[PDB]
């Protein structure tokens, strides 16, 4: 009946572990009663997790707040975060992010490390956007675990991001990658233009690509394949569920635009919906741990790969 | 069927007197035939009043024009403007304002002082906001008379500005004063910014506020209390009147942003026009832009000590 | 005879400690041979100190360089910086800082953490402005030390900024706080001016002043008190330290070798109040916090010297 907030501080500890060993179990612990949950990472007052669950206050004290303090609090005792060396060392970067993301709230002093704070509920009504976002985060949570558990065993997080990013542009755009690779290049170029050593980092990337041309092109051909097929299976599962789970989100977003409840996140229908959904992908990858820099590199490599595969035809 | 225009020249006399004792009785004389009438101050070719009246050609010749020529004419003969010594002193400013305002027309020589002139009907049928604007001006004419009279009798024009700006901010914004005190400070900041000695100005305006803080907050609560009241018997008279007169212009405006008429638009959008209208009223009452900004700035400050400590 | 430079990378580590427990002893160990020395914080290619020392190449090899390598190097090994997970994350800040200062050096990649680097001697000739700045830093090093200790055993760094800028304005201006409080506000205004949330910043800062009016105002009289005359330590020390510089400032303004960035009035004060701001950077105060402090200072001087 409303959205409740939790703050889990975990400054220098392994975040991918708190997710899998503390937070996910707590979520299963009340998943018959409150199936509607999701978490986010954020920087403010120290690297932490934001937990959102939506039920009543009476489900709160009965089955959801306890499963958090027991199972999450249980992780905190068992593998507690060391601590950061100096909070203030991050202040100027945090000042700049707060201007950029418009954040609001203290930047200093940090919240106590390894503590759990119940933060109460989101104000009163959420925008149409925030409601769509929340649904998206919830629906994609098992895609998080799957990705992280593959990470915990040494799979390359960038390689997961490569697959997801490519799959969304192929499946959920109108013309597929031949047309959509442009939006993959555009993203990376936006970053490079921001860096005063852009042209030097480009060829570092255009070079790193060509040393590995055959590996990238033939995975992109393969990711696109698991993205289109038209079957009850393929040979890369996690791409298939990504697409299948985003198509509703695309449709619901195009509907929402057509009728007039968005345009922040022929064209503003289809094309607005694509941009919302590729943006939701990027927002997922940040939830997986990907750094903006890694994200831009992955998009840049997708667009190099696409340009090869779809140019040679 | 049209908007008919008259100019009355009054270069150096008490413009409020001409309004209360010339233009008001003349408007009262043809009200039954043509009750859509209003007037605006203006600078071109000497300070003058601009009268706008909506009626048919036959009514203009038979009742409207004779009323203005005779009644306003009487005021002008009883109580003439002495004139401006040297009008060319204003020519460089007038060239500039004619540029910023898209004012075509001669700038010199000035139109003869203490004189009326028919200027015909308005170009051709009007835009959509235009029509909303004329309605606003027409409807707030009694509001103008009440204020100008109170000023002539010794009430502070900047205080009236104060009340009306606070009240419009509180009552017709979505969040009321605690959210909209931001819009007030912003409107003052555009002017402080655009001004080479802003820093020294902000000091003065904050010295002032400091020196007199309790008066501004007690007054602020007052206007706010009265503006949200609803009970025709709260501290201040005009404030409810003003709110009570403004609301349905905003309504006409929100609806007129909720079907693409002119330029999120139900909310802060019709309130933006309603507060611009308030600012246009203050100019009509004779308040300078400088005094307006000063009013806005003191109002924002006062709100801080009120809605900023809870 | 020459200015020798050292860079000490210390990226995530507590830069106050490296200063108090590392650079400060090292600087004492060669005081006897080389008493003109200072240090500056900076961000380019990673949070790092820059060490400035004046002697001969001979004293450099014999006493200064071994002092830095052994004492500062000793600190570094005992309390290594853990590092930054992701240096590129800092470009939304550094890139902005680079245009603001007019930097023109690469920002990437970062110099390796926990490391001392010899950087040789300062190109060659100094400006009169440089010589006077290096000396300001030199003579105020103990004042840095004096502040970082208080900050380390608990004090509010902002309150120290507050006390320092208010007192520099009262004791070293043409006619005290009533005239000088303008420059305070002028300093904050120049930042609000260039910030697109400028007006929303001003509401935050004025609400905050309103919530706490008698705190700031009573604090202000007290700082205003000690400046002129025994109840605030650093204030009267900070003033006494600073008065010989503005006199030196006025003399070389009059004789004329500077005005590139009537004259012993709004010139000596302009230079000494701006050196106060450079001290607060040295103390680890962010631009944002400094501007904030300055705003609240000015507002508090409104409620004090505005009811004249």
């Amino acid at each position: 009946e409303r959205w409740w907030r939790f703050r889990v501080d975990y400054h220098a500890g392994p975040m991918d572990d708190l997710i899998l060993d503390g937070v996910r179990p707590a979520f299963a612990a009340f998943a018959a009663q409150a199936p509607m949950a999701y978490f986010l990472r954020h920087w403010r007052r120290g690297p932490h997790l934001r937990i959102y669950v939506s039920t009543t206050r009476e489900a709160l004290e009965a089955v959801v707040r306890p499963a958090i303090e027991h199972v999450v609090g249980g992780y905190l005792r068992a593998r507690p975060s060391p601590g950061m060396a100096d909070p203030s060392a991050f202040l100027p970067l945090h000042e700049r992010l707060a201007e950029l993301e418009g954040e609001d709230g203290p930047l200093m002093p940090w919240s106590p490390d390894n503590t759990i704070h119940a933060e109460g509920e989101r104000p009163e009504p959420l925008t149409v956007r925030d409601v769509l976002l929340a649904d998206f985060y919830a629906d994609t949570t098992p895609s998080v675990y799957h990705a992280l558990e593959r990470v915990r065993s040494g799979a390359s997080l960038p390689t997961i991001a490569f697959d997801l990013v490519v799959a969304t542009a192929h499946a959920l755009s109108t013309g597929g990658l031949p047309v959509a690779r442009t939006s993959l290049r555009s993203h990376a170029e936006a970053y490079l233009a921001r860096r005063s050593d852009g042209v030097r980092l480009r060829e570092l990337w255009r070079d790193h690509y060509a040393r590995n041309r055959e590996a990238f092109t033939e995975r992109l051909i393969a990711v696109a394949s698991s993205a289109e097929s038209a079957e009850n299976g393929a040979h890369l599962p996690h791409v298939r569920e990504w697409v299948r789970r985003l198509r509703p989100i695309r449709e619901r977003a195009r509907a929402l635009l057509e009728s007039g409840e968005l345009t922040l996140e022929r064209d503003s229908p289809a094309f607005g919906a694509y941009r919302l959904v590729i943006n939701c992908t990027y927002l997922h990858l940040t939830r997986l741990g990907l750094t903006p820099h890694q994200r831009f590199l992955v998009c840049h490599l997708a667009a190099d790969a696409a340009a090869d595969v779809y140019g040679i035809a | 069927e049209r908007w008919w225009r008259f100019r009355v020249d009054y270069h150096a006399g008490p413009m409020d007197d001409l309004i209360l004792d010339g233009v008001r009785p003349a408007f009262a004389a043809f009200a039954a035939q043509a009750p859509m009438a209003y007037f605006l101050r203006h600078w071109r070719r000497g300070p003058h009043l601009r009268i706008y009246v909506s009626t048919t050609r036959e009514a203009l010749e038979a009742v409207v024009r004779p009323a203005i020529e005779h009644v306003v004419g009487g005021y002008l003969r009883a109580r003439p403007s002495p004139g401006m010594a040297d009008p060319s002193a204003f020519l460089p400013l007038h060239e500039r304002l004619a540029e910023l305002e898209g004012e075509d027309g001669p700038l010199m020589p000035w139109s003869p002082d203490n004189t009326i002139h028919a200027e015909g009907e308005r170009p051709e049928p009007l835009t959509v906001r235009d029509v909303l604007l004329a309605d606003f001006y027409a409807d707030t004419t009694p509001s103008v008379y009440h204020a100008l009279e109170r000023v002539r009798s010794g009430a502070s024009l900047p205080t009236i500005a104060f009340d009306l700006v606070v009240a419009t901010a509180h009552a017709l914004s979505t969040g009321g004063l605690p959210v909209a005190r931001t819009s007030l400070r912003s409107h003052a900041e555009a002017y402080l910014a655009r001004r080479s000695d802003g820093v020294r100005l902000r000091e003065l305006w904050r010295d002032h506020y400091a020196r007199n803080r309790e008066a501004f907050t007690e007054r602020l609560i007052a206007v706010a209390s009265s503006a949200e009241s609803a009970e025709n018997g709260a501290h201040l008279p005009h404030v409810r009147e003003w709110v009570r007169r403004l609301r349905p212009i905003r309504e006409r405006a929100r609806a007129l942003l909720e079907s693409g008429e002119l330029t999120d638009s139900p909310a802060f959008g019709a309130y933006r026009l309603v507060i611009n209208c308030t600012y246009l009223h203050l100019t009509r009452l004779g308040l300078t832009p400088h005094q307006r900004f000063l009013v806005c700035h003191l109002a924002a400050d006062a709100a801080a000590d009120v809605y900023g400590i809870a | 005879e020459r200015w020798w430079r050292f860079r000490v990378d210390y990226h995530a580590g507590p830069m106050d400690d490296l200063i108090l427990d590392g650079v400060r002893p090292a600087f004492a160990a060669f005081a006897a041979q080389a008493p003109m020395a200072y240090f500056l914080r900076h961000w380019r290619r990673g949070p790092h100190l820059r060490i400035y020392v004046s002697t001969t190449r001979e004293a450099l090899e014999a006493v200064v360089r071994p002092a830095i390598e052994h004492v500062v190097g000793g600190y570094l090994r005992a309390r290594p910086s853990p590092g930054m997970a992701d240096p590129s994350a800092f470009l939304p800040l550094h890139e902005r800082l680079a245009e603001l200062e007019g930097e023109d050096g690469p920002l990437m990649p970062w110099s390796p953490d926990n490391t001392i680097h010899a950087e040789g001697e300062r190109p060659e000739p100094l400006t009169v402005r440089d010589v006077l700045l290096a000396d300001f830093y030199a003579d105020t090093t103990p004042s840095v030390y004096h502040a970082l200790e208080r900050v380390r055993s608990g004090a509010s760094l902002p309150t120290i900024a507050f006390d320092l800028v208010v007192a520099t304005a009262h004791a070293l201006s043409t006619g005290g706080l009533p005239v000088a409080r303008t420059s305070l506000r002028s300093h904050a205004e120049a930042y609000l001016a260039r910030r697109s949330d400028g007006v929303r910043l001003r509401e935050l800062w004025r609400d905050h002043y309103a919530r706490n009016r008698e705190a700031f105002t009573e604090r202000l009289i007290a700082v205003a008190s000690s400046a002129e005359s025994a109840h605030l330590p650093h204030v009267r020390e900070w003033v006494r330290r600073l008065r010989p510089i503005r006199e030196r400032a006025r003399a070389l303004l009059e004789s004329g070798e500077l005005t590139l960035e009537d004259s012993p009035a709004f010139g000596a004060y302009r230079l000494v109040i701006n050196c106060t701001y450079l001290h607060l950077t040295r103390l680890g105060l962010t631009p944002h916090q400094r501007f904030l402090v300055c705003h609240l200072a000015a507002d508090a001087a409104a409620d004090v010297y505005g009811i004249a």
Binding site: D104, G105, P106 | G308, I309, A310 | A155, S156, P158, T159, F162, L204, W205, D207, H208, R211, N212, A215, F216, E218, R219, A222, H231, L292, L296
Partner: peptide, 11 residues
């Protein structure tokens, strides 16, 4: 005569 409050977001 304490240290100054400085959390402009304390409300």
């Amino acid at each position: 005569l304490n240290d100054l409050p400085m959390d402009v977001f304390e409300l």
